[PDB]
Amino acid sequence: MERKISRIHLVSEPSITHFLQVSWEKTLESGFVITLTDGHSAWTGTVS
Amino acid sequence: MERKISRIHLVSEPSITHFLQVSWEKTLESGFVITLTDGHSAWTGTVS
Amino acid sequence: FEKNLKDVSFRLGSFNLEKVENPAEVIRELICYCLDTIAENQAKNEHL
Amino acid sequence: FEKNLKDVSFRLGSFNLEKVENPAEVIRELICYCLDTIAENQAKNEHL
């Protein structure tokens, strides 16, 4: 799908931020992949 | 802060040339630093 | 993520994130995407 | 490294211990610099 260069700086940690790699379904209300990375660990995610 | 996009590749990971804009201090011919990134920990160094 | 309006705070939707390690490769992909989109934007600049 | 251009078969340059305090500091700095330069490129795209 589409990656987007957007760093929402996480208040809990600066070394990790949710970069945008959204794989949006019929609506953004539906699930999509967001990947936030650290350099020591990474995490994707979907919205319920 | 003289930083230019001339990328580097790993010895441990020769498959992936880690896309890194090298950062050195000033007028690299009078002190030049090749910047580091192994994907796990990117490093900006110092020289004399 | 939050959502507050009309004199009362409330809790917007949320990401049920999923942990996928190897941040190195995804960071490499993100920075490659950054460099490529910079290059295409510069090409559009010079053509215009 | 060793610069491997023709008539160049030596170790090119020397460096001190190349490292930073934060593993992601250089990576995140690269991402934000990429964001800045793509912003500049797109602004000049629209202008021209």
PDB file of C-alpha atoms in Angstrom, chain A residues 1-2 5 9 15 17 20 22-24 26-27 31-32 36-37 41 43-45 47-48:
ATOM      1  CA  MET A   1       0.000   0.000   0.000  1.00  0.00           C
ATOM      2  CA  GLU A   2       1.348   3.459   0.943  1.00  0.00           C
ATOM      3  CA  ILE A   5       6.823  10.047   6.247  1.00  0.00           C
ATOM      4  CA  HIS A   9       6.786  12.250  18.397  1.00  0.00           C
ATOM      5  CA  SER A  15      13.608   6.872  20.255  1.00  0.00           C
ATOM      6  CA  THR A  17       7.643   7.178  16.938  1.00  0.00           C
ATOM      7  CA  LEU A  20       3.051   6.059   8.723  1.00  0.00           C
ATOM      8  CA  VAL A  22      -0.948   2.940   6.479  1.00  0.00           C
ATOM      9  CA  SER A  23      -2.669   0.059   4.707  1.00  0.00           C
ATOM     10  CA  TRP A  24      -6.141   1.524   5.000  1.00  0.00           C
ATOM     11  CA  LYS A  26     -12.597   0.734   3.211  1.00  0.00           C
ATOM     12  CA  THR A  27     -12.345   3.430   5.895  1.00  0.00           C
ATOM     13  CA  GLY A  31      -7.948  -1.454  10.534  1.00  0.00           C
ATOM     14  CA  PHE A  32      -4.677  -0.416   8.924  1.00  0.00           C
ATOM     15  CA  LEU A  36       6.562   2.447  14.885  1.00  0.00           C
ATOM     16  CA  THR A  37      10.241   1.568  15.177  1.00  0.00           C
ATOM     17  CA  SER A  41      12.614  -3.117  18.337  1.00  0.00           C
ATOM     18  CA  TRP A  43       5.958  -2.669  16.189  1.00  0.00           C
ATOM     19  CA  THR A  44       3.210  -2.704  13.592  1.00  0.00           C
ATOM     20  CA  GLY A  45      -0.422  -2.283  14.584  1.00  0.00           C
ATOM     21  CA  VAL A  47      -7.003  -0.045  14.846  1.00  0.00           C
ATOM     22  CA  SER A  48     -10.080  -1.788  16.222  1.00  0.00           C
TER      23      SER A  48
END
